[PDB]
Amino acid sequence: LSNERYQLLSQWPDFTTMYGKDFYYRAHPEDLKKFYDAADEYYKLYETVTEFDSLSALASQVVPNYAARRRSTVHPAIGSTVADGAFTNFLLSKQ
Amino acid sequence: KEELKVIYGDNVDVKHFQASPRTPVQQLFDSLKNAAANKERAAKEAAAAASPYLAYAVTKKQEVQADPSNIPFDEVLYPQLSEELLELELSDIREDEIALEKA
Amino acid sequence: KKQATENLMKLLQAYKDIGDAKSEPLLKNHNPRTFEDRDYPVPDFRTQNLKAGDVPKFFDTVISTRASAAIASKDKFWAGRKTEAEAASAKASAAFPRVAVPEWKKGKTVSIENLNTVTDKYAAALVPKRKLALPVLPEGVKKAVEDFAASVGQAKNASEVSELLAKSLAEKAVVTEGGKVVEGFSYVSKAVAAKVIATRRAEVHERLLKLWAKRLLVSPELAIVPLNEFDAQLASKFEGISPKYQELLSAVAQGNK
Lengths: 95, 103, 257
Fold this sequence. Notes:
Chain C: This is ATP synthase associated protein ASA1. Chain A is mostly helical.
């Protein structure tokens, strides 16, 4: 999934091709401040999407709730469809 | 002073380089005054880099930052901007001279 | 966020387009001196009924109101320019190069032969789009001219002829745009511009010294009211001038006896 987000941080336009002072002084000051904030924002997004040493401790947050759902008192593989089909068998049998 | 202490040490006497800034040939001649220590320090950094990616990044950034032609001169890049930067002080000097000619 | 940054780049390209349609100076529209009305009616302080210390505050409100009007006219110009460029950024191209990131596939890896290509694309944007071809002296020419001086026998001024070659190559340094040399390019340096500023400041300062020299050769009593304390003495009538320096300027003017 981080590859899927990286692939759309890969199609970001090069703002570094508009840093020169001929683009500085032609532009409205608030638009240039917004442009430099947008460049700082891209550096934030790219610095955090390439923190791949965080994915292990992110995966350790999905493990305990899933692993507690598989400590079921009925069966590890039980679900709603099989339990509803077995209630269909149980209820439509002779009590 | 921050961009001048890289060359001339920390106690740099900023008034000489504010009264008369460095001509391009003096910027070149004090880049080359410190080129050997830059080369040896960059080789020592690319040896002790954490990975060969960082080692190649160190040597590439240094071999771009060691060629003295790559010093960005704002007068060569933007000549008609540096002319307006000159007229930005010559205009208020002219305003002072206009007041003194009125007096 | 990608669409907003692309709209900002289209807006900056439209700013540069409709600023170079008018071919205007770069700093002119950011300088609020150019948006200042120098044909202002300039309110005369003798009608405004001021007491002794009330005239510099009048001068400050006149100066601050004219500066506020100049800044507000600058802001009105930039709002008009923003409207003119936001209305023409929608009709544009938006064909920009993308940020050089290393090409990483879905389940595969990334190789160092591509990460190095990405840093080459980074450091190729560190070199400026127009640069002084400042020649560093190659070693093969330096040793050649040092030994050519050594065969003449002047090998103890080989250092001076080497720095003379490097200085003569550096003083006639030509510029290159993309490696191709620019034909007919003249640039005014920063040391040249600062020398021009220093001579202009020195001649205007000697004009000021000449002004006060004439004024203190005719009436030398003027050196007893300090320059910061002068505007605090005025009023709108002449009799409203503060009597702090009236008696002293009267009695000093009569000479040393």
